[PDB]
């Protein structure tokens, strides 16, 4: 029985219910995330930027089965092409716009990775990826506006792979946190 989250806090409570069992209903989770209307005051605490690259800010640790974070993207900031370590990944825009470029898993052969597609994710939209769908890059292409996104990962994971667009070669990356619960974590 899915209800609209009134606030980020409400959203988080609802996520604990949704993940109360062993199986994830992806469409339900995506629906509730989308239904949350971004309110900058509610997440300002987590929206910590860095001048040179995008940041990952932990919001909620979940119930063992997921966690929830906020990512902050300066003008021109973006990610590698990457996977998500056999986890569900939900991405919702809270401010600005992000360009998401989808790539297929590379064949064993060293080849240029060619874009399957791209789309512009706009404020409040929720996108979903998992490894069975493919790989992606996410970028703030704006010259004038920062972007902020809300991400849900299930199960949680702290490692992933980055892919070189020229070759498809991957490298294992350990992902870090800029902050946890509003507290900067050097």
Annotated binding site for Fe cation: 82, 84, 136
- Among the listed residues 65, 115, 75, the one whose alpha carbon sits nearest the alpha carbon of residue 95: 75
CB atoms within 10 A of CB 53: 14
- Could you give the CA distance from residue 111 to residue 105 in angstroms, rounded to a whole number? 11
Give the residue numbers of the binding site.
82, 84, 136
Pairing outcome for strands 98-103 and 115-121: antiparallel
Determine the angle formed by the axes of helices 26-35 and 8-18, rounding to 10 degrees: 170
Contact (CB, 8 A) for 32 and 5: yes
Q: Which residues pair with 60 in a beta bridge?
A: 68
Contact (CB, 8 A) for 139 and 101: yes
CB atoms within 10 A of CB 39: 12
């Amino acid at each position: 029985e899915l209800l609209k989250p009134r606030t980020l806090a409400d959203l988080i409570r609802i996520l604990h219910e949704l993940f109360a069992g062993d199986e994830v209903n992806v469409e339900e989770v995506q629906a509730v995330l989308e239904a949350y209307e971004s309110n900058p005051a509610e997440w300002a605490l987590y929206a910590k930027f860095d001048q040179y690259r995008y940041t990952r800010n932990l919001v909620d640790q979940g119930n063992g089965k997921f966690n929830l974070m906020i990512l902050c993207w300066g003008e021109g900031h973006g990610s590698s092409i990457h996977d998500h370590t056999d986890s569900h990944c939900f991405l919702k825009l809270l401010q600005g716009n992000l360009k998401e470029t989808l790539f297929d898993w590379p064949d064993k052969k060293s080849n240029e990775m060619i874009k399957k597609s791209e789309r512009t994710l706009r404020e409040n939209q929720c996108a979903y990826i998992n490894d069975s769908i493919g790989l992606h890059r996410v970028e703030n292409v704006s010259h004038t506006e920062p972007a902020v996104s809300l991400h849900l990962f299930s199960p949680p994971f702290d490692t992933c792979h980055a892919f070189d667009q020229r070759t498809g070669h991957k490298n294992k990356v350990t992902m870090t946190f800029h902050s946890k619960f509003g507290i900067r974590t050097p």
